[PDB]
Amino acid sequence: SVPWFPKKISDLDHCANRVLSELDADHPGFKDNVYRKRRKYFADLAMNYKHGDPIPKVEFTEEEIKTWGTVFQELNKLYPTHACREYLKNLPLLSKYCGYREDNIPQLEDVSNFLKERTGFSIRPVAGYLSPRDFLSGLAFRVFHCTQYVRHSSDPFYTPEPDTCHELLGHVPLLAEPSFAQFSQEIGLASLGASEEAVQKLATCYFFTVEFGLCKQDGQLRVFGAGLLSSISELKHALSGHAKVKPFDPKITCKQECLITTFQDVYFVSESFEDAKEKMREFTKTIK
Ligand SMILES: CCn1c(=O)[nH]c(=O)c2c1nc(Cc1nc3ccccc3[nH]1)n2Cc1ccccc1
Ligand SMILES: [Fe+3]
Secondary structure, rough: OOOOOOOOOHHHOOOOOOOOOOOOOOOOOOOHHHHHHHHHHHHHHHOOOOOOOOOOOOOOOHHHHHHHHHHHHHHHHHHHHHOHHHHHHHHHHHHHHHHOOOOOOOHOOOOHOOOOOOOOOOOEEOOOOOOOHHHHHHHHHOOOEEOOOOOOOOOOOOOOOOOHHHHHHHHHHOOOHHHHHHHHHHHHHHHHOOOHHHHHHHHHHHHHHHOOOEEEOOOEEEEEEEEHOOOOOHHHHHHHOOEEEEEEEHHHHHHHOOOOOOOOOOOOEEOOOHOOOOOHHHHHHHHH
């Protein structure tokens, strides 16, 4: 039978809280009580959020802003030579309209309003990890489930999980691009009511495009994956020449394991967002 799926944007209220502040043993904040309480604060904001609410604005601490600034400064040195053209086109729009600065962490509500105007994408704060079914279902309504907390200050350059720096620097500039927004939405649409098997394959395709994708533009390899765009070391590695790269091909890509604690073993290159979108259309017919 077909599993429940959201039919309108407010139905995400019923799955966005089905979370699967619970830090892993190796988390840099695992023994930090103050950070643990800060994380509970953010998780509660997300749990209490309902569709239609303005996303609660947060007063970030000086420490949090310094962590953001450190990451922001170093990544921005690399984007011109590493990021895809769509990313580079939209980043300055975010400095102008959403307050992307070294000494200011943008508010999710402002970013959500910006995205709504540009592509109809919006943000929903999320407490933590959701099933791939629930997470991808948001994309069907152009909703990006977004973390609001900041990584621990002890290691600004590495995070064991998504944090708001990753969301804001990695994902948002491409969600502002219509071709990419359509590509993303169609992953979500394909997932709705799909088999467990199909959802898992869509999630892996999502991982190797939206999170760790490369693309070819004017003959050059460029980065569009958000996980790369917010990781200084892997961003450099991905275009270093020491990385294994393969063409994006959903039937093959979906067989690849998604690594968490290390660099990826392989990156997949899309010809364009339009082509990646076409390839997913062909693929989803075979699994759904
Ligand atoms: C389709 C896989 N997938 C899933 O099945 N469920 C998710 O909830 C999910 C996700 N993917 C991302 C977003 C995400 N960005 C990442 C960047 C680097 C490494 C892992 C990432 N997960 N999320 C959101 C998320 C993940 C962990 C903690 C908080 C929020
Ligand atoms: Fe991500």
